[PDB]
Coordinates of C-alpha atoms in Angstrom, one line a residue:
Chain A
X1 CA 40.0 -202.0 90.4
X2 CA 39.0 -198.5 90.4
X3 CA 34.8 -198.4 90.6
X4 CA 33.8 -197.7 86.6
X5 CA 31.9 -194.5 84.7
X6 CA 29.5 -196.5 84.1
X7 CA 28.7 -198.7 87.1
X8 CA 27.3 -198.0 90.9
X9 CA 26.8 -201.7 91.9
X10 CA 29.5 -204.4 92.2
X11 CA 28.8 -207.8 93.6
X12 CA 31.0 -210.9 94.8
X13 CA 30.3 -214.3 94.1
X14 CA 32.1 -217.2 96.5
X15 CA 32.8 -220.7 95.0
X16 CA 34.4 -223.0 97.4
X17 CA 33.8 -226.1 98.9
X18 CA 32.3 -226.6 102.4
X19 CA 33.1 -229.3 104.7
X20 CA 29.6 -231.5 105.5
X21 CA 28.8 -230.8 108.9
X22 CA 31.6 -228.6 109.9
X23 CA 29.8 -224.9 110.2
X24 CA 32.7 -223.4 112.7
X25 CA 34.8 -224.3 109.0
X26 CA 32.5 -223.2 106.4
X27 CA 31.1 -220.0 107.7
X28 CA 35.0 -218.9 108.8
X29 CA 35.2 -219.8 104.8
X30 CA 31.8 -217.1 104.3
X31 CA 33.7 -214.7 106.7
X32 CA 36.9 -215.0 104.9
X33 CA 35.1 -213.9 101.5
X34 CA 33.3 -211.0 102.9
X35 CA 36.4 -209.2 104.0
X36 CA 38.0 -209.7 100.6
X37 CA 34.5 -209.0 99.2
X38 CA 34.6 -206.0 101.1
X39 CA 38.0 -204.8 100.5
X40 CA 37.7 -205.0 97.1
X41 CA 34.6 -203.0 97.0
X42 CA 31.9 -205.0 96.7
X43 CA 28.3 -204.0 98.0
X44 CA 27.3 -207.4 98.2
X45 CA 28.0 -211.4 98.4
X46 CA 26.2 -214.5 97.2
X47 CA 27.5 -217.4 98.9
X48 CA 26.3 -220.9 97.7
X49 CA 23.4 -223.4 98.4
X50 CA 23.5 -224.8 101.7
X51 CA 27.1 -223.7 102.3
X52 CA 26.8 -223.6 106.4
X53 CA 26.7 -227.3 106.7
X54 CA 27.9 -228.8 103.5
X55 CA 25.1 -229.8 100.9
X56 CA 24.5 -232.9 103.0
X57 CA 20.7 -233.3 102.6
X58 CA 19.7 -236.4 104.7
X59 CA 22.6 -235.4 107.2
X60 CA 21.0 -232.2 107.9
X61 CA 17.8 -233.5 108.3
X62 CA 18.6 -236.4 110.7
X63 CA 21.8 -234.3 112.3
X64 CA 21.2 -230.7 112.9
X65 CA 18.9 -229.4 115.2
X66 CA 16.9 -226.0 114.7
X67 CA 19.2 -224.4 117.5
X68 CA 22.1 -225.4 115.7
X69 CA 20.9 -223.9 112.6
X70 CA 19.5 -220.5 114.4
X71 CA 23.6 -220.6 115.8
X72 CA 25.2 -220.3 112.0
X73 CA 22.2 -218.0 110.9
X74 CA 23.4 -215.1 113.8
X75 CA 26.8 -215.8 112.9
X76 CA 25.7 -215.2 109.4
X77 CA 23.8 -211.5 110.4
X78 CA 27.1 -210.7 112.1
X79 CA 29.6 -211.2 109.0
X80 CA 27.5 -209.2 107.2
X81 CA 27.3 -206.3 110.0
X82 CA 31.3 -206.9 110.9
X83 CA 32.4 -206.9 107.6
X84 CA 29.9 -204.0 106.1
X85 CA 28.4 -205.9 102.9
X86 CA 25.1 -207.0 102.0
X87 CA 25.2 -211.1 102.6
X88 CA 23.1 -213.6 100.6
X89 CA 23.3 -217.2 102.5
X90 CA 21.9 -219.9 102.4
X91 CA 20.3 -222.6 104.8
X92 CA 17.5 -224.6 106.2
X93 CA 15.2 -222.8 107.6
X94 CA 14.3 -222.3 111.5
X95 CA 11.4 -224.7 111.9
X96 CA 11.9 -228.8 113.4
X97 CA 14.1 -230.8 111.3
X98 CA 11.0 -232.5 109.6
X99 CA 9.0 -229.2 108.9
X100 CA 12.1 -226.9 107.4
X101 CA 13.0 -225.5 104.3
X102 CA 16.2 -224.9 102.5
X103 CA 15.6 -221.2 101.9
X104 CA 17.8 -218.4 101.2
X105 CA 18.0 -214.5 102.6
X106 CA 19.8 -211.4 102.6
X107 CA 21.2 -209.2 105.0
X108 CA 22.2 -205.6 104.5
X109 CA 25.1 -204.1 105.5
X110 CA 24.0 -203.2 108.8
X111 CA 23.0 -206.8 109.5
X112 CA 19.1 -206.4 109.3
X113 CA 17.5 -209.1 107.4
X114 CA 15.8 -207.8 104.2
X115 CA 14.1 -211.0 103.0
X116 CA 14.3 -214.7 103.3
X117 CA 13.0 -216.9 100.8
X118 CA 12.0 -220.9 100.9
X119 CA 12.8 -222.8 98.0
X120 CA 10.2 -223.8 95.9
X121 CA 11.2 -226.4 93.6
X122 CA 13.2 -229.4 95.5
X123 CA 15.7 -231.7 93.4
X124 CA 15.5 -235.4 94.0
X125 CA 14.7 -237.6 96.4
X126 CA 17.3 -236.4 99.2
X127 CA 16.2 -233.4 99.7
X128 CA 12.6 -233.8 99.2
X129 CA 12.9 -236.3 102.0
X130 CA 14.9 -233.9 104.0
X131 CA 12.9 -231.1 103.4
X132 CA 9.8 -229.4 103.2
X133 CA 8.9 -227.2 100.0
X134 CA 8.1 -223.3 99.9
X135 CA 5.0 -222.5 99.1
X136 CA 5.6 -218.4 98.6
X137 CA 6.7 -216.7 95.3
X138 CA 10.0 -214.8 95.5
X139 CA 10.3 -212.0 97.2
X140 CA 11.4 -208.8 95.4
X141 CA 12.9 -205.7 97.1
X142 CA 14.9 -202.2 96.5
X143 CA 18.2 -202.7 97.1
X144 CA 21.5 -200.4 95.6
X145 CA 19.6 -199.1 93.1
X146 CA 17.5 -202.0 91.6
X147 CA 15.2 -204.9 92.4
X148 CA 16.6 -207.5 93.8
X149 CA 15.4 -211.3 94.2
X150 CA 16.0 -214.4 95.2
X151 CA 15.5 -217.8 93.8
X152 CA 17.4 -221.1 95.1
X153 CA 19.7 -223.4 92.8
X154 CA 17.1 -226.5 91.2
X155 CA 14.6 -223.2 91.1
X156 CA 16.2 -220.9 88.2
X157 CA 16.0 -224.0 86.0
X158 CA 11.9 -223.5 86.0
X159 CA 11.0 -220.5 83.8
X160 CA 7.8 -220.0 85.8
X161 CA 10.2 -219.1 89.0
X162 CA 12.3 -216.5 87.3
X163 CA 8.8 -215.4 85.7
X164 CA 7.6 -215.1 89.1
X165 CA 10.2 -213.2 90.1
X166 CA 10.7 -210.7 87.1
X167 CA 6.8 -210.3 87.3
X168 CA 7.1 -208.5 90.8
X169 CA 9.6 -206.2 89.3
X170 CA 13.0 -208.4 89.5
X171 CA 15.9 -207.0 87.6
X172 CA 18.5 -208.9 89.7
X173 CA 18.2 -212.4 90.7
X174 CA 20.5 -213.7 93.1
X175 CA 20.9 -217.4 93.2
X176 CA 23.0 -220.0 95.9
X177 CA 23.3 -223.4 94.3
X178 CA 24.9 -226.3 94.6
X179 CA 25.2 -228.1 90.9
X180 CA 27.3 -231.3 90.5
X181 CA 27.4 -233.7 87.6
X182 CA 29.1 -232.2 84.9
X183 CA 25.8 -230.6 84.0
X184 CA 26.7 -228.0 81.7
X185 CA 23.3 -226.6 80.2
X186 CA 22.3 -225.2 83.3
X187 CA 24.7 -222.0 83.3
X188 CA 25.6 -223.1 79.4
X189 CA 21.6 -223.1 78.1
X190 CA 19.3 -222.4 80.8
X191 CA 20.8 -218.8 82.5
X192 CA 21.7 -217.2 79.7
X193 CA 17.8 -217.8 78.7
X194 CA 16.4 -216.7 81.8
X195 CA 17.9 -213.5 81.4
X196 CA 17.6 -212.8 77.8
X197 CA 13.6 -214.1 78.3
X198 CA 13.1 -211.8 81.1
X199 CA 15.2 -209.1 80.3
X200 CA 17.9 -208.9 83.5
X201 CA 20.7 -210.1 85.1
X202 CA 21.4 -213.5 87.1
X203 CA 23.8 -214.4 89.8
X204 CA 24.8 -218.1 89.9
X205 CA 27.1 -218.9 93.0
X206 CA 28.2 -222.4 93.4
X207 CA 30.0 -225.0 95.2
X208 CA 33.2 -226.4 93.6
X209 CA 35.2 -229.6 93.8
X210 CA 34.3 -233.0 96.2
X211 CA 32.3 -232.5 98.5
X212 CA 29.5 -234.8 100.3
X213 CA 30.0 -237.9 97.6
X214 CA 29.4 -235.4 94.7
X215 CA 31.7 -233.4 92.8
X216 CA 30.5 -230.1 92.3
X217 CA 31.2 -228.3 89.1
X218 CA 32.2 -224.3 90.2
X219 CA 30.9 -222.6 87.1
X220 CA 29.8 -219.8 89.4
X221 CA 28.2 -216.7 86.6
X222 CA 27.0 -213.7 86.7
X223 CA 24.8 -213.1 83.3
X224 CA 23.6 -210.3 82.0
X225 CA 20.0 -209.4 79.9
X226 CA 21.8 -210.1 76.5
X227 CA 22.6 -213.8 77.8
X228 CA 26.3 -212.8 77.9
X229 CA 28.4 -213.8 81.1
X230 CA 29.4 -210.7 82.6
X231 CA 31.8 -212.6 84.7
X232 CA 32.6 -216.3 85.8
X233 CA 34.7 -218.8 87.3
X234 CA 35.6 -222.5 86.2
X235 CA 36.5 -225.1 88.9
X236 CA 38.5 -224.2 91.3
X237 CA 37.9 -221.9 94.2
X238 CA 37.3 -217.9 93.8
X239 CA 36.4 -215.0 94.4
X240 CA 34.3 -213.5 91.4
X241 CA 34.0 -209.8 91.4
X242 CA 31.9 -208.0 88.6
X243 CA 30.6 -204.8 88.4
X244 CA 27.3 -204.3 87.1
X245 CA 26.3 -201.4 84.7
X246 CA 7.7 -206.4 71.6
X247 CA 8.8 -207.0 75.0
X248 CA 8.3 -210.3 77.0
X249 CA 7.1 -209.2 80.1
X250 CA 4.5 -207.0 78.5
X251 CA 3.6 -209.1 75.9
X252 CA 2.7 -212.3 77.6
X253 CA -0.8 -213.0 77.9
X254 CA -0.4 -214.0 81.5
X255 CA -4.0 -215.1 81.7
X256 CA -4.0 -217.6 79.0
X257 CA -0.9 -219.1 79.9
X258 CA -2.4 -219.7 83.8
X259 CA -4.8 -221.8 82.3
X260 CA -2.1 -223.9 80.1
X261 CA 0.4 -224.7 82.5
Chain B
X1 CA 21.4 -240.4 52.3
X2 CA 20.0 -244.0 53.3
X3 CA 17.8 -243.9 56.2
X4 CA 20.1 -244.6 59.8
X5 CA 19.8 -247.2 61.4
X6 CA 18.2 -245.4 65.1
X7 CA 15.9 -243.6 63.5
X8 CA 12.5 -243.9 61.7
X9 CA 11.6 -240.0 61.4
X10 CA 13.3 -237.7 58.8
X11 CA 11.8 -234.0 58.6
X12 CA 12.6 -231.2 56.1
X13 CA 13.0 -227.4 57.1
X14 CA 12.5 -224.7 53.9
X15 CA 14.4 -221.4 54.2
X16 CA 13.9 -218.7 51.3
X17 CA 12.9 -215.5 50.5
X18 CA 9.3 -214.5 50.0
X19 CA 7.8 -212.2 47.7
X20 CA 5.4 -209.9 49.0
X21 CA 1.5 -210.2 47.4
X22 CA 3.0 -213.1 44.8
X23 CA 1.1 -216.2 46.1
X24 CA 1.8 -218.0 43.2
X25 CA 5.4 -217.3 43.1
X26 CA 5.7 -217.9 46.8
X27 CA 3.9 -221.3 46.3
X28 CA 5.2 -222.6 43.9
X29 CA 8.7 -222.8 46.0
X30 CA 6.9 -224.7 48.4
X31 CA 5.8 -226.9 45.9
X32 CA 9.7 -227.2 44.9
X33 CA 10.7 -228.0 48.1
X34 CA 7.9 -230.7 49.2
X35 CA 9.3 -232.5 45.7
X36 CA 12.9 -232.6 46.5
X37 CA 12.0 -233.4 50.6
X38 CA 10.3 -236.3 49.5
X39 CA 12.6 -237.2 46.9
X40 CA 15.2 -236.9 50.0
X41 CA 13.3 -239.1 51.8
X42 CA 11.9 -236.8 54.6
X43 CA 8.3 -237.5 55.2
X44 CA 7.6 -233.7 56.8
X45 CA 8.3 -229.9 54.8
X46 CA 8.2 -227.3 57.7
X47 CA 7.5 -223.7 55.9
X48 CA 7.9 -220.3 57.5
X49 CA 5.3 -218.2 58.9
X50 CA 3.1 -216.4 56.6
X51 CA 5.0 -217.6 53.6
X52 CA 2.2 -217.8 50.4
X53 CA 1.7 -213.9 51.1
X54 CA 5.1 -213.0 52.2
X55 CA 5.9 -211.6 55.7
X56 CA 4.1 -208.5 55.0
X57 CA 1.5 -207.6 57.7
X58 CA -0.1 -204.8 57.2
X59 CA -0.7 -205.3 52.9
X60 CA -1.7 -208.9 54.1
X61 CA -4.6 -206.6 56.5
X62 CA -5.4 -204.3 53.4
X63 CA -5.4 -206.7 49.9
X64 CA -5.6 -209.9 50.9
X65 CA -9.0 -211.1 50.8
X66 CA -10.5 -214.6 52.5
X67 CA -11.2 -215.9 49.6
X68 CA -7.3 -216.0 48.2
X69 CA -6.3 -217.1 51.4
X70 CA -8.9 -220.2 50.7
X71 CA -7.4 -220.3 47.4
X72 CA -3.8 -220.6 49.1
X73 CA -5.1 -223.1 51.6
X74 CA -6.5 -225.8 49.0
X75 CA -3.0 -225.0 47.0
X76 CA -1.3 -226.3 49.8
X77 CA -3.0 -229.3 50.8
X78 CA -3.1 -230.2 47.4
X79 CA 0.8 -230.0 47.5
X80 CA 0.9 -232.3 50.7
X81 CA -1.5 -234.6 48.8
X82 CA -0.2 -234.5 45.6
X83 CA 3.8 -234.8 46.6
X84 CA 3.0 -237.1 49.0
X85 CA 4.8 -235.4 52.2
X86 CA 3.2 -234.1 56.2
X87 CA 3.2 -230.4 54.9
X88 CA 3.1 -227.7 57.4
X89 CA 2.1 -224.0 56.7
X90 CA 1.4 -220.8 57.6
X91 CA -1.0 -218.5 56.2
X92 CA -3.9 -215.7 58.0
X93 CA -6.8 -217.8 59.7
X94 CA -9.9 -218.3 57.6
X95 CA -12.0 -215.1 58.1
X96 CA -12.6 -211.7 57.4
X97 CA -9.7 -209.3 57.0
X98 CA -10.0 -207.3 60.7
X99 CA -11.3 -210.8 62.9
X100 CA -8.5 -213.3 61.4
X101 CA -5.1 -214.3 62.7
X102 CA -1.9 -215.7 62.0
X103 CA -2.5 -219.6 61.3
X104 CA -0.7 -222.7 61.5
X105 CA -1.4 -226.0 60.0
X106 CA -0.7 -229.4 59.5
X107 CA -1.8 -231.5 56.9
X108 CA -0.6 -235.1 56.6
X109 CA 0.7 -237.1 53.6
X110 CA -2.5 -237.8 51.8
X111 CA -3.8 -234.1 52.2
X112 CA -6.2 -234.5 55.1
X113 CA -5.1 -231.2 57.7
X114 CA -4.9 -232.7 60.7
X115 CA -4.6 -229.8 62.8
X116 CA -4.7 -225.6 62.9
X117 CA -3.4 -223.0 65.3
X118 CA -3.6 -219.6 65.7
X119 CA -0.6 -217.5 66.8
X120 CA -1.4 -216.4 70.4
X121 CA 1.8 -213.9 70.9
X122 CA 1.7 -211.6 68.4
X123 CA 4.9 -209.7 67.8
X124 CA 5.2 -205.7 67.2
X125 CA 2.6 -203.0 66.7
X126 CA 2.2 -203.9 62.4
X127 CA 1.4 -207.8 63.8
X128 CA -1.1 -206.7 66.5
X129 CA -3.1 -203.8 64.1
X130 CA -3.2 -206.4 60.9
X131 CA -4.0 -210.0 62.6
X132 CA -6.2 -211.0 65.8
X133 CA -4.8 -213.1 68.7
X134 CA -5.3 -216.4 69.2
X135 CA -7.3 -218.1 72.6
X136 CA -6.3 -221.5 72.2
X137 CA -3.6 -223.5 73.6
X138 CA -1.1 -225.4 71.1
X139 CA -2.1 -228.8 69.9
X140 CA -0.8 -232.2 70.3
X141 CA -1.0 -234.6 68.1
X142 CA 0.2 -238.2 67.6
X143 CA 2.3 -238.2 63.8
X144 CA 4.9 -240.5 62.7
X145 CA 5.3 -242.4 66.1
X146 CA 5.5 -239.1 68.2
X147 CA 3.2 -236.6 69.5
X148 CA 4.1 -233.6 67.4
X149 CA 2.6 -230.1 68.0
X150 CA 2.9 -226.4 65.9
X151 CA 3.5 -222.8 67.8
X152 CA 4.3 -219.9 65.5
X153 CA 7.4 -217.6 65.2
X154 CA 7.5 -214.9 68.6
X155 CA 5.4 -218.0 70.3
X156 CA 8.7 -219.3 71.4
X157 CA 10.2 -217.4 73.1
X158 CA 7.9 -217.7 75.7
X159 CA 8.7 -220.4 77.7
X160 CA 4.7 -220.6 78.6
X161 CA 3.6 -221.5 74.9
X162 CA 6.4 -224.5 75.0
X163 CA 5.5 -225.8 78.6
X164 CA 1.6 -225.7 76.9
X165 CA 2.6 -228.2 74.5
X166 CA 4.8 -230.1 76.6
X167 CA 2.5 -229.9 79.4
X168 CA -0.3 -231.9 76.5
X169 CA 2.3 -234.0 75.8
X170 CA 4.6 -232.4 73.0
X171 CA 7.4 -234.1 71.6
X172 CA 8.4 -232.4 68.4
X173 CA 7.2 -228.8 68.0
X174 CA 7.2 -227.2 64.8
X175 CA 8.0 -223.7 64.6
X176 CA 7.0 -221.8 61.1
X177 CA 8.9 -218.2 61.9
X178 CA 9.6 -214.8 60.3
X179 CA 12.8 -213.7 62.0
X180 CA 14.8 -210.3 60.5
X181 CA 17.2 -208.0 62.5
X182 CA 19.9 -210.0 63.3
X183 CA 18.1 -211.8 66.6
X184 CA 20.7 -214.1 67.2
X185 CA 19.6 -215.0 70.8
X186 CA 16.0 -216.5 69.5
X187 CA 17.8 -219.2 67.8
X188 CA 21.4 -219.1 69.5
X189 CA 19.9 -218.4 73.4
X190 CA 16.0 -219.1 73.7
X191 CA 15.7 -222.5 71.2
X192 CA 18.0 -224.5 73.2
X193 CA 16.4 -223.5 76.7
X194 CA 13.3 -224.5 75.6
X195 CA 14.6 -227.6 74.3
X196 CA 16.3 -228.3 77.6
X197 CA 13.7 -227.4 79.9
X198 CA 11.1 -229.4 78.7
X199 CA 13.1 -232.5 77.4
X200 CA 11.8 -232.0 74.0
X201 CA 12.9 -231.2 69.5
X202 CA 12.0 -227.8 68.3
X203 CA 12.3 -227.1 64.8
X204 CA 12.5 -223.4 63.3
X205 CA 12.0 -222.4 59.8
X206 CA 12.7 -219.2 58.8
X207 CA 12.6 -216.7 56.0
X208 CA 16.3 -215.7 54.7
X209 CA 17.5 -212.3 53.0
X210 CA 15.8 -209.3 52.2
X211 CA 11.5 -209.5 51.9
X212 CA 9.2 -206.3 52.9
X213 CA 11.1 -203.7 53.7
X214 CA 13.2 -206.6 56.7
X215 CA 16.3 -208.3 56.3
X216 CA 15.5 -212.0 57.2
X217 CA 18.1 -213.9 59.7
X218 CA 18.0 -217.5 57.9
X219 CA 19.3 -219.7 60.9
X220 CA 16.9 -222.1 60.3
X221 CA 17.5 -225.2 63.1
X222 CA 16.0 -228.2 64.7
X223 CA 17.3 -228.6 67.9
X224 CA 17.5 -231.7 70.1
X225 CA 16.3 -231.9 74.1
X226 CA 20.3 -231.5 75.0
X227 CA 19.8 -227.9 73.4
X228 CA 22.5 -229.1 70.9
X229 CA 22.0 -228.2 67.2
X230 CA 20.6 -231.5 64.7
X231 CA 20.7 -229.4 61.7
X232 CA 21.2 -225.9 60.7
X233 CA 21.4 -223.4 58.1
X234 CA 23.1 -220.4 57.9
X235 CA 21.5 -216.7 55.7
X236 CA 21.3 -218.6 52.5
X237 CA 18.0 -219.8 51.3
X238 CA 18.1 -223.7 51.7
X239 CA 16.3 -227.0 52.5
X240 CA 17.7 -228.5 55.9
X241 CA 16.9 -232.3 56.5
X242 CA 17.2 -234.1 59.7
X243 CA 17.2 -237.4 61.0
X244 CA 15.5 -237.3 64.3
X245 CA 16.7 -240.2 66.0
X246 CA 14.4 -235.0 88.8
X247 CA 12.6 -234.5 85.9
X248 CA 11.0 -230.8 84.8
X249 CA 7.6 -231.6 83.3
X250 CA 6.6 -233.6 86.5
X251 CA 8.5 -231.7 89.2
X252 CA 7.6 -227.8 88.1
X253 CA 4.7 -227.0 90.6
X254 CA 2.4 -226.0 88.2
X255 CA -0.6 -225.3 90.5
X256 CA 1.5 -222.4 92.2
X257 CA 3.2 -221.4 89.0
X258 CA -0.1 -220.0 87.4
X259 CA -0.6 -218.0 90.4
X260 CA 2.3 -216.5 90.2
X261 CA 2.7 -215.4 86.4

């Protein structure tokens, strides 16, 4: 509805399912969510992990070529331009097939690409196989007011990348996933702690419903530095919309704990 | 009641009120509760932090001398000896006034103290001017047929002080705490995270009710590695017992993680 008192900043989460191997399909689906995005005032939208070509690991790396991927990233700078909102995507990244990344960036409104981050922390054996891990810490960067960030779904699970993040000022990390498996402590236990631990707020934007042999579970959440969902969604398909409004980060002795890990 | 059938570890938690500068009084319900844990079968009493003295910082700094915390010391291994329970305390480290800090111990069923830890993340400006930090990194420690290791009140909600003990092999990590102001995301929020996302049993005792000048939370818990509660208390003083019946530690890339904190 009307923008709040209280607020200056409201961001859109799509949760959907993408169709492996189908980008002409899921970036119409990305397009589709920006103009609603858009129309109901949001600044901004996180789409989820991977959404281009369907989370479809081994596919991707045996299937889609570094021109096809370069293809759905201009289409992806354009939405954001065409439809005037900041656009968080996700895919792999522009190198060969066997050197790439899944990584993550954001485009402002006018297009230009603000940051692109390579995720760090790879889940399993698909997608270590199908991909090759970042090796940078998570960019942080002004953006509507705050500091914004970027971490990529297995990532947020690992305090030490949310630390990373928060340590180079983060008070807003935006995260694509893809989460299947009924595995409910992620945005049940681990978010919530992320932000209360680091004092800011998350975004969590998933894939929901079959899709590649898995069944994702939605959940997609934005949480704020209390630990308290601002907003979410459940399993089916949406459009979230939330408008945003002794101390750890101090207090950590950083150079003992570098030692420990 | 009679000892299940999956599980060969039962622990005890004590939650009370202290009384400032009354060692004798404060020990003596230690020495309570060690009788009726054994009696109950547990074969480990977890006590809060700074419990002999009460939770009182700055008196602890001023009147309390080395020589009754030694005094304190010997009363409670005697008590872990002498009642025939793993006993595990908190009282100021062994030396002077201004160069000691906030201490942990362990002490096994025939008395001998297997193991001592100084709180590393000290919590307000009262805890940093009475108490010095501690350099050392949690220990671990085989104990009942699990590697249990001790971390102290504001300790925990770090996520760095639990990966230390999980990264030395941590199991069970025993948490003596002082927790007042109605906190409920320490216990409700961080516990289970750090449960979670090491794979790990935390268990927090706490003070309950009104001691120094504070209002203690109770919400004493021992928490599972699905970040689900085993046991738990509510604001009443009380003596919980438990039976204690991709992966994170070996995926986190720890060797760019301590650049990065």
């Amino acid at each position: 509805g009307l923008v709040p008192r209280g607020s200056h900043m409201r961001i859109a989460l799509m949760q959907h399912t993408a169709r492996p191997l189908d980008p002409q399909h899921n970036l119409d689906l990305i397009d589709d969510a920006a103009a609603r995005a858009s129309e109901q005032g949001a600044q901004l939208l996180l789409t989820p992990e991977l959404f281009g070509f369907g989370y479809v690991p081994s596919q991707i790396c045996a299937q889609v070529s570094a021109e096809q991927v370069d293809a759905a990233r201009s289409r992806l700078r354009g939405i954001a331009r065409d439809r005037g909102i900041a656009l968080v995507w996700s895919l792999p990244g522009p190198e060969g097939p066997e050197q790439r990344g899944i990584t993550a960036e954001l485009a402002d409104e006018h297009g230009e690409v603000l940051a692109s981050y390579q995720k760090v922390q790879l889940y399993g054996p698909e997608e270590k196989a199908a991909f090759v891990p970042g090796e940078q810490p998570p960019p942080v960067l002004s953006w509507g007011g705050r500091q914004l960030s970027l971490l990529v779904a297995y990532d947020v699970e690992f305090p030490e990348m949310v630390r990373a993040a928060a340590a180079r000022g983060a008070q807003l990390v935006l995260v694509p996933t893809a989460l299947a498996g009924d595995e409910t402590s992620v945005p049940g236990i681990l978010l919530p702690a992320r932000a209360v631990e680091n004092g800011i707020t998350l975004a969590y934007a998933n894939h929901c419903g079959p899709e590649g042999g898995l069944v994702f579970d939605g959940g997609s959440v934005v949480v704020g530095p209390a630990g308290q969902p601002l907003g979410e969604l459940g399993v089916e398909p949406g459009l979230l919309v939330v408008d945003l409004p002794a101390d750890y980060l101090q207090d950590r002795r950083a150079e003992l704990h570098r030692n420990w890990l």
